[PDB]
Write a protein that binds this DNA or RNA. Structure first.
Lengths: 246, 50, 60, 72, 105
RNA sequence: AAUAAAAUAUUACUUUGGAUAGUUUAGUUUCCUGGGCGAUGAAGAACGCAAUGAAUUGCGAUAAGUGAUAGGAACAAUAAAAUGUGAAUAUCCAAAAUUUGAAUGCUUGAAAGUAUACUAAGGUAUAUAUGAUAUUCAAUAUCCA
RNA sequence: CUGUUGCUUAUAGACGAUGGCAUCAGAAAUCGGUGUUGUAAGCUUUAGAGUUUCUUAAUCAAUACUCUCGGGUAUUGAAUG
RNA sequence: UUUCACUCAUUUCGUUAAAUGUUAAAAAAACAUUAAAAUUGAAACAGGCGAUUGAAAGAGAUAGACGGGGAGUUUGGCUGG
RNA sequence: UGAAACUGUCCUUAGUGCAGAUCUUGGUGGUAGUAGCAAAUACUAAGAAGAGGAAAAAAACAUCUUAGAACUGAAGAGGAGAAAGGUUCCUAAACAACAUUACUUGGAUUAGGGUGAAUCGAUCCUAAAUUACAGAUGGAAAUCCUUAAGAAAAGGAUUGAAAGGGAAUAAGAUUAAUAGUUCUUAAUCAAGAGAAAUGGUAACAUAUCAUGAACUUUAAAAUGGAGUGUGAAAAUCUACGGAAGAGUUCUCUUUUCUUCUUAACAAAAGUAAAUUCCACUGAAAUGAAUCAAUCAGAGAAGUGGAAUUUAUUGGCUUUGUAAGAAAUUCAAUGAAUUGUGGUAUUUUUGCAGUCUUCAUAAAAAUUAAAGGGAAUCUUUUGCUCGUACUAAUAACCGCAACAGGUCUCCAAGAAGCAAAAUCUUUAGUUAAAUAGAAUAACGCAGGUAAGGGAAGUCGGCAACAUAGCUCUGUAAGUUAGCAAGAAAGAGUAGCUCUGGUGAUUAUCGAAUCAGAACUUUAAAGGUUAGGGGAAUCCGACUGUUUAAUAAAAACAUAGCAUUCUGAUAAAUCUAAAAGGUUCAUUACAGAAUGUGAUUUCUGCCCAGUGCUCUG
RNA sequence: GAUUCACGCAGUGUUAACGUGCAAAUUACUUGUCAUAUUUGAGUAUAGGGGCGAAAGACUCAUCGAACUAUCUAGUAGCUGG
């Protein structure tokens, strides 16, 4: 048959990201001595709206500690930040909302966000709206600490991985029911080309494996092995279970 | 168009220059068969495609 | 009004007219014709009369 | 409306005159010549296009210098 | 009524293609090319439009007299009068507190 | 029963058409000799040049032709001028050879342009990879005061 | 004799045909008869709900009265002269 | 052979490769640069730019499974059609 | 007839014999002077030019001028551009061919002429994107990478917009044709040449003034949409006073119509609207204000100031330019005039707040300011390229002068809610595949009809019927929002009057509403202009769909549910790849599926085939 | 992502006109729709067992249940015509 819609998605055609009005890459600043063995102070100049993402972005401004000028950064807002607030980033920073601390200095039970999976990689985990990761325990024997990811999974990271103390702003975004197809159309203004999704059973046998006959149905089980080739991998993949959960 | 490049305009002028018939004196030469220019065209008949 | 080579600009034509006819030129406008030639409108200085240059050249 | 009506908007050139072969085969968006294969250093010739070889090749032009050399 | 025509070769109602129809001798109407509406300067901190500076194109500020493109004050073209009073108080008060708290407490 | 307007048939002449016959400055095949392009800019493309040229032919700002050497009295559709103190015509020679094109200072869409150095305008050189030589440098890479 | 032709011909008619008259021919007005509609335009015309300006006379006014059984049309496929 | 420890190939990363290692000595939306003074001021060295993984994972060869995502092909004959 | 080659016999050789192949190519008949030359309302008289209206009406006659009658109706059949065309533009000679007759006409033949820029655009910058040296990959062609890998490029290469950004020009006149391009007059811009200031309490202000390097920062260029209010200009309409010309006039009409104008760039008599700040003062008995809002002890209201915006200086009147131009008349080049207003409509251009987003609605070239304190008026020049014309019921794309298609700017009167239908003024045109006579059938387009009223038919298909506005009145059902313009009834014309709604301090002004006598042909209906009700099925809705026989119950949809994935991952493109996409991302995320709003509810089955297992 | 009219646009019906047409899909009336899931110009990106698809096997230059063009190729034909 044809190449299904999932195959056509990996080619980088019209399915490219609609990132033209985006503000930029949101991350911590690059690690240095003044962050490893001191604290640098940042000023939250403004809080802006980055298209395509649900959380506001803070236009933080630091001072260059080795040369003359400014280090205009772009952080992800923690809930409660306000314009003109001072935020301190470093190993000796105080445990306040918005401060950037290595994950080893946070007491067990601290709620953090924008955590680095690897030291110095400028933020990976807990970046969506209203999300956060909790610190579970420390292990000074091998300099590793345990955190609980927003998916519930537990992850062990190095004790010098940085994080922002608090909650990502914009929580409760997905609790408001979209009511109209027009509203969902505007949701993907700064996203990829995915929205109007035709059911595979409404397709033809050439287009999709579900492309059916005289009655709209599937015909074969929709739970498939992980090793299925691209093209026939349509439906539920490696499904340990199905049906409504109890 | 009203707007054209310099090289394109010169190729327009040459197509104008080549749209002429045989001069009468050339038609009086001995053993002459060239009476009409069969490469001729007119704006409303054939488009020169350039 | 003259006809000049296309590869000549307005500055060359002004100097060429002054050298060829020993006059003064204050303004030159050029348009390139379809065939390829460059029509040049050379306006002489007020104290120079173009009627005498025409008969000297041979236009009349 | 796939016939007469659809041909109303055909006022945007795809190919313009090429610079190496002189034909209207320079694709504007593709930035290549479909006939002489411009940008490409080698002239575009294919063994299945045997007629297109005899339409433009050695000896189909002026031979300004080669005619002196071969006679020499 | 006399109807007019575009004088330049632009034929679309673009932002830079603004025109004005004015009357002339004999009742004829001519077409002028009008100028876009610009914004002024804003305080570097509070983002308020500064007073005393015109709202013209960036290049026209060069034609203006030296005194007409700024305000005679500290920072005088980048900060409002309120924006500067805060700057002076912050500098003096914090240095004074840094003088008494530390530096021979 | 009658008419020959139409219709039909034969021959002569004329007409529309270009078969047939006569003919060939064109092809096809085989064989012999060579198989002689280009950064000293090729093949190709574009533009321009005749006293009257649109195509074609020849040519390149020295333009349907210049010099030289052979050559011996023409060309012609119409005029002119030149011409045995040398017209036509011929050429593996000399000078000259526009814009491009491997295209090569940078850019090129149908793009008009433009930087530096040397000898205002003109003309040269400056792409990439590469061999030898010369010169200036880099790295404690190995020693070393 | 017959046909064409004329009456922009009819008792006929797609075209032919057919029928009638062809200088006592024909055609046209006007004119009377016969029909259709509904009472023309004018005015110093008498009713006019009211209004205005003079100072009580003008003027404006849908409609309505007399002249007016008016005016207009009437073979074009109507009938006389 | 299995379990260990390391890094040195190898992987994945980050920066203007901007203090690595070892010795030594939350009141304030503001400013901070082109140094005075006597080579210091502004300490030294490592043969590691800083982390991460690490002899495992990747790409290769051979072998087993799976693989209509895809390629090639076949789907006998008689016959009151 | 034809005018230069050919023939008979014997062997040899073959591209060697045609009625067919829907045979190939070329030519030609009957049909046949037949079908047609019928959308876009339409032409007529006199004259001129021409061979080209003659004639027993041969009933028709192309072009040009005048007169009559007309159409497009100012979202145009008007005046101009982008693309596309390419000389079709203007003029002259000429009509063999072409524009389904003809043509003296032509976008057709022949020969000439025509496109003028320091200020308009291209050129300059960057957007989506595009392409190089070196590097990486590939058996190869070549691919990847676009600043990461580089001894390359203070920081990152090329291209990419005649609609984005952008230094600077206008009025009149002129040509057979070009004009923000020529001429006259009047301007502007860029690049050049000849121990360092005052004033104001403050917001802030000063014909250059009044020094300001490296380095850093800020702002501009540079930012959605809707709706309401309003400032100013123009057009239309209108009030007062006129000047000039024109039309009507045996019936009147102090009458009806036209003209009465002004540029770029600058000046500062006079005088506005809105917003934001500054000084004095300190609000409660809370005040201030808008159509709406909205605001105040982090300071309202008041009084006095400062600033910015309002199509160039500084918004409007006014002034210079500048009346010497231009318009309307008059005389035969020369003469006359060129006031002041509107609590009216529309358009344009700004301003102020309000609403809305799981949408927040570009970058650079380039410019200015600031922090810091290093150092001690005249004149010249402004190069290259485009510029003619159509832009469409005849110049573009459809074989064409094709009823199809193709992006824009300017936009008068009537009437009306209306840029609707209908009529008209400025401009354009009367020709746009030929006409004349007769007035048969059958047609295509538009109509009417006695009595009955769907009996016709698969089926009220087609047509008929309702139709504007005001007032009264309005059910079942319901997601409580709707149904609903439900249904249903009444009124409406002309003329003469009356009253309500304001501003300025008696004068002035607006269309809107209500009411009363009288009259008649008893009044929305010229044009425009809903048929209504009772149920059943499907889809919840707005939306999309088989270009050219299916527009739907099909697709989408919001909602519901399930599966995998902690990023060195999941899905997935590539032959390979420091390769690519979601991803400028990080579980409120990414990817893969089924059902299809809301309400109510989703029962039992793990045997079979799948999937999975922490085994 | 309320109800309607207009400039426009589409194509519900007449299964009207035309059907060797004005037109290789158009015309007239009727109907629907006529700004936010709106309409539209230019630039740009996606290409053949590929693309693109609010899904009709629809569209990809009058060509699509696999485009166009050239070579293999005078492809093979137990079948039809001469």
């Amino acid at each position: 048959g044809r190449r299904t819609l999932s195959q056509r998605k990996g080619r980088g055609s019209i399915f490219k990201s609609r990132s033209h009005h985006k503000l930029g890459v949101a991350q911590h600043r690059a690690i240095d001595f003044f962050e490893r063995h001191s604290t640098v102070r940042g000023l939250v100049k403004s809080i802006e709206h980055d298209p395509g993402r649900g959380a506001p972005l803070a236009r933080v401004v630091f001072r260059n500690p080795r040369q003359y000028g400014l280090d205009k950064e772009l952080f992800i807002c923690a809930e409660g930040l306000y314009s003109g607030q001072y935020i301190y980033c470093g190993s000796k920073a105080s445990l306040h909302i918005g401060n950037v601390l290595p994950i080893g200095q946070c007491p067990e039970g601290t709620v953090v966000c924008n955590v680095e999976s690897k030291p110095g990689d400028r933020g990976i985990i807990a970046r969506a709206s209203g999300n956060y990761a909790t610190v579970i325990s420390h292990n000074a024997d091998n300099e590793t600490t345990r955190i609980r990811l927003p998916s519930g999974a537990k992850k062990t990271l190095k004790s010098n991985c940085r994080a922002m103390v608090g909650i990502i702003a914009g929580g409760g975004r997905t609790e408001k029911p979209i009511l109209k197809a027009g509203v969902a159309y505007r949701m993907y203004k700064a996203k990829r080309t995915t929205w109007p999704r035709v059911r595979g059973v409404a397709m033809n046998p050439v287009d999709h494996p579900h492309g059916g006959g005289n009655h709209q149905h599937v015909g074969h089980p929709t739970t498939l092995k992980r090793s299925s080739p691209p093209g026939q991998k349509a439906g539920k993949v490696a499904a340990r279970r199905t049906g409504l959960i109890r | 168009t009203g707007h054209k490049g310099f090289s394109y305009k010169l190729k327009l002028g040459k197509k104008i220059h080549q749209n002429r018939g045989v001069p009468q004196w050339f038609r009086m030469k001995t053993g002459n068969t060239i009476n009409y220019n069969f490469k001729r065209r007119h704006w409303n008949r054939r488009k020169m495609g350039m | 009004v003259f006809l000049c080579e296309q590869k000549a600009n307005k500055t060359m034509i002004k100097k060429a007219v002054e050298k060829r006819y020993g006059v003064k030129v204050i303004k030159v406008n050029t348009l390139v014709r379809l065939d390829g030639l460059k029509k040049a409108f050379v306006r002489l200085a007020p104290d120079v009369e173009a009627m005498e240059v025409a008969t000297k050249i041979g236009l009349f | 409306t796939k016939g007469t009506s659809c041909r109303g908007t055909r006022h945007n050139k795809t190919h313009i005159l090429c610079k190496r072969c002189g034909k209207r085969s320079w694709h504007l968006q593709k930035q290549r010549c479909a006939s002489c294969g411009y940008p490409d250093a080698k002239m575009r010739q294919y063994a299945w296009g045997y007629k297109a070889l005899r339409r433009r090749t050695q000896g189909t032009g002026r031979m300004r210098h080669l005619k002196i050399a071969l006679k020499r | 009524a006399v109807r007019v025509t575009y004088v330049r070769k632009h034929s679309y109602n673009t932002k830079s293609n603004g025109i004005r129809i004015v009357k002339t001798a004999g009742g004829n109407m001519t077409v002028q090319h009008r100028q876009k509406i610009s914004n002024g300067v804003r305080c570097g901190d509070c983002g308020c439009v500064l007073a005393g500076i015109r709202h013209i194109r960036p290049h026209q500020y060069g034609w203006l007299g030296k005194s007409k493109r700024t305000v005679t004050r500290a920072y005088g073209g980048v900060k409002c009068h309120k924006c500067v009073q805060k700057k002076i108080l912050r500098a003096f008060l914090i240095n004074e507190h840094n003088l008494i708290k530390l530096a021979a407490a």
